[PDB]
Design a protein around this nucleic acid. Structure first.
Lengths: 97, 76, 104, 94, 82, 93, 103, 98, 80
DNA sequence: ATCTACATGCATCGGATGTATATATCTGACACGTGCCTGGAGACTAGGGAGTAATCCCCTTGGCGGTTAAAACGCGGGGGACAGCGCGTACGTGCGTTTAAGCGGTGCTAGAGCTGTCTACGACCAATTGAGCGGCCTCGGCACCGGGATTCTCGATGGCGGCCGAT
DNA sequence: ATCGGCCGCCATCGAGAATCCCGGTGCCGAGGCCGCTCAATTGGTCGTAGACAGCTCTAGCACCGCTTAAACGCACGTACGCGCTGTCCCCCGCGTTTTAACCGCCAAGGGGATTACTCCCTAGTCTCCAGGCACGTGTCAGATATATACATCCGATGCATGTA
């Protein structure tokens, strides 16, 4: 009957996944997502293997940088949890909108 | 025109009800004010203002806090 | 004999001369311009490789991996400002946790 | 297949210059190669606009020095200019 | 006729990415918000890459197409060429 | 001493949409600065487009792809229509 | 002239000279300067129309830079394109967050 | 006496200066600052009248955009006053300072 | 260090009002002066390099526009 | 004690503010006309980039069976999100005095800029050979695994000081 | 109350889960090697970009002197900053069940990639000339001004409340 407090396994995951460079998103669903959306602009599209790998690296990097900026927004609100308010704020200051 | 006892006696009965060594917090008093007595919208205002008075005259005793933000206990 | 040896650079000055003429940058290319660029590229390349090399030896792994490259650039203020617009593939993130999150 | 130019050999020589006993992975070598290609296109474009701003029909060594001072941070630009001007002197010497 | 493959991004996957970002706690509504942001980003990026691909008269999207598209977006990517 | 500008051409287009609208000197300079940026943006991208596909000529086809990348969807759609329409009329007579 | 032939007000000939002398490529196509003139004329017309609406809305017969800033930021399409450019003597769009206004 | 409370005139000032495009910084002291800073990089510099004005136009635009972004940070924190904390956060997310 | 103090309190107050803030903290006025000196220093750093490249002792408006163009913030209306 | 008479909160009305609206008029910048000139259009020739068909062949898409790591689901509850008291004081507002900025003078001249001259430089080019890259193959650095060694996390447990209500 | 009594707050110890550090070992891929080849280099030739001297004459620097308007030191104080704390349910931990990513191998052909061949497209050159710009000269749209019209804002008065 062993139970960890609330706020420790998350932190160990932080250190764990920050030390590792492996892709955190599953490969196959991301490819299918790319196919569906790409099917909007063109039909019967061929995609290089190296092309799909490039999309996943760029996406996770963009999201991680965003997650740091979102984390700062939540902390600036004297909050330990990130919320959609922080996301909408971070994107607005970035200029993406 | 709802009938209810004194606001100096209503906060006194709510400190007696729940025996906590740290004391009975003001916000818990309100729940006892509007569940055991019939009060209006103005209850929370006068409950705060009732704490303003009988806190300085010696009727109430501060334990961990400031004003009506922290806790208190009825002086013996 | 070659111009790379004459300038004292490993990076090909001859290749840079060809690339400057065919890159539609100007009508004519100076004689000293491809030499200057080769020196600059080698210097900047050397800085990244040494900081990444120290990052490789700090991890007890001779061979440099993209993780070592990212650590070198982001920890250097000058290099981070220069590469602020560049994302390094398989670089990961610097292990950073704000102190407000840790319990006490 | 057709022969495709690269910067792999020159990057490898410099690697042995800084660290003789240290190697590099293929992916990281590609990162270094992409970095080098980016620097080339960057400095040359800024240099091209510099010749167009000053109404010059030739890109000289003087335009490259100014472009470096604009793009690179203060410390790296000072040092990079030293190495650049030094290599040009040695080239005109032989 | 949308088969939405955007739900293929799982909750613990979004949880891991935020852990790499350095956040201790995540709101419940973040998971849906992220899928929207990710869909918009990819939509914009894929739009530009495919335009490069259509300009080259290819029916195949090369990795070089993504690199050029990202460079125009402001995010330059190293390691896949360029 | 002689120095060329777009001032005359910008004023003509102004009179086409709104006849009853002048233009201060400052705003005309703003329009001129705006015009120079658009040229340089698309032409550089078109130059890189010609350089990426290993083509030695910048064609009308290179301009269309560059426009689709820079401008938002609606503005890109309309701009391509007017462009392609004008090219057909030019090659006519 | 070629400007009348293409049906454009912007000078295709001037654009043709700058493309040959601008170091963009070795050779410049015949239809490229026509395409560019059309594109330049269209975007200028869009900017000019929203700014034209901005001049009559201010009860002024002559367009000033204030009208230029208002047109771009209020147009979703125009704001995205020019997001990286600051307009001189333009001011800011009049926006006040709802949290500052009292009850 | 007719003494107004605090922030109402501020709000009227908000509307006044948002409606006006005039430069809010005094011209002459900014120029001397331009002279002073430029003297670091080069000595005995001449400045066109239009050159100093360009620096002044660009500066006010950059600072104003930051203050809007800074205001959002303070508002996101449930605060009616801006503080240096909001500025440092906004600049870090912008990418100017790491 | 002498004329950097030339940016007055009411000047900074007006710019923040245009930004839309109702109340301003006291420590903000100095923080902005530091950032502005740094900002001007970078822009002037780039502008002076443009001026030195043309071997002129006078800084043209074209120097500021190009400098701003290189920093990423483009300015319209001055010889753009 | 009861009667009178103060402190408190949320609408209604008041002058009194700065704002707005208007007519009239001062003005200088926008609008309009002309000679000047070199830049755009038209003619013409050359040639090389590119469209096109044919062929090659690398690699993208499509498939399936198993393992098992990842995900989804669920419940418990810890501690973080959040409004209020409130104490505190830094702001804003509004005066009078203070500073020097903006305006309007021309003088002086450093220094931008158009110009003519033609020399130093790099485009252009043909023959040349090695730098450098496509293919191939070894083997050692590194990813991986089992284990103990070690840091760190947190309920369990005894000790102790402040303060009720009970015996 | 003096109290045993008893809820609050405290610190070292003790699982016990996790990361770390060790060697051991298996394997992909870096690093050295080789032959094909296409591109760097060199020698030779002219045209013109450009280095640079001298002239034109604009524009930036400068002190001069007043005119208010912006800047300044101050007093008074009010709305808000912001820690403390209370209270409530959001979201972590994580066990159990469920789902499908991942592997690995590989079957098939779409289509990127290259080569080779035919020719339209575009720079260059030359002549011609008009669109466009420098410049002298105009007046109406609009900056400015003082007055009228009026939009907010906050003091001011009040039924409304139980108050001590």
């Amino acid at each position: 009957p062993h139970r960890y407090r609330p706020g420790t396994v998350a932190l160990r995951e932080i250190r764990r996944y920050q030390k590792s460079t492996e892709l955190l998103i599953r490969k196959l669903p991301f490819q299918r997502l790319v196919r569906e959306i790409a099917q909007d602009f063109k039909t019967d599209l061929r995609f290089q293997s190296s092309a799909v790998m490039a999309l996943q690296e760029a996406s996770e990097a963009y999201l991680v940088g965003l997650f740091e900026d979102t984390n700062l927004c939540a902390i600036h609100a004297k909050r330990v949890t990130i919320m959609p308010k922080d996301i909408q704020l971070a994107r607005r200051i970035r200029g993406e909108r | 025109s709802a009938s209810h006892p004194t606001y100096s006696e209503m906060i006194a009965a709510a400190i007696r009800a729940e025996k906590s060594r740290g004391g009975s917090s003001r916000q818990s008093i309100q729940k006892y004010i509007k569940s055991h007595y019939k009060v209006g919208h103005n209850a929370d205002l006068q409950i705060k203002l009732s704490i303003r008075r009988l806190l300085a005259a010696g009727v109430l005793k501060q334990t961990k806090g400031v004003g009506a933000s922290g806790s208190f206990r009825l002086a013996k | 004999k070659s111009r790379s040896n004459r300038a004292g650079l490993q990076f090909p000055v001859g290749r840079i001369h060809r690339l400057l003429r065919k890159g539609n940058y100007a009508e004519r290319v100076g004689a000293g311009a491809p030499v200057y660029l080769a020196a600059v590229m080698e210097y900047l390349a050397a800085e990244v490789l040494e900081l990444a090399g120290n990052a490789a030896r700090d991890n007890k792994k001779t061979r440099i991996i993209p993780r070592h490259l990212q650590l070198a650039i982001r920890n250097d203020e000058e290099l981070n400002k220069l590469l602020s617009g560049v994302t390094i593939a398989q670089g990961g993130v610097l292990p950073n946790i704000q102190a407000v999150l840790l319990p006490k | 297949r057709k022969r495709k130019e690269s910067y792999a050999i020159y990057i490898y020589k410099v690697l042995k210059q800084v660290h003789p006993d240290t190697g590099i992975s293929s992916k990281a070598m590609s990162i270094m190669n992409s970095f080098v290609n980016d620097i080339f296109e960057r400095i040359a474009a800024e240099a091209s606009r510099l010749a167009h701003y000053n109404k010059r029909s030739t890109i000289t060594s003087r335009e490259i020095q100014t472009a470096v001072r604009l793009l690179l941070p203060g410390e790296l630009a000072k040092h990079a200019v030293s190495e650049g001007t030094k290599a040009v002197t040695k080239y005109t010497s032989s | 006729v949308l088969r939405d493959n955007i739900q293929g991004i799982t909750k613990p996957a979004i949880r891991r990415l935020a852990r790499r970002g350095g956040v201790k706690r995540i709101s419940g509504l973040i998971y849906e918000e992220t899928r929207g942001v990710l869909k918009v980003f990819l939509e914009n990026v894929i739009r530009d890459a495919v335009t490069y691909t259509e300009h080259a008269k290819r029916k195949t999207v090369t990795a070089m197409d993504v690199v050029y598209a990202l460079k125009r977006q402001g995010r330059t990517l190293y390691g896949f060429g360029g």
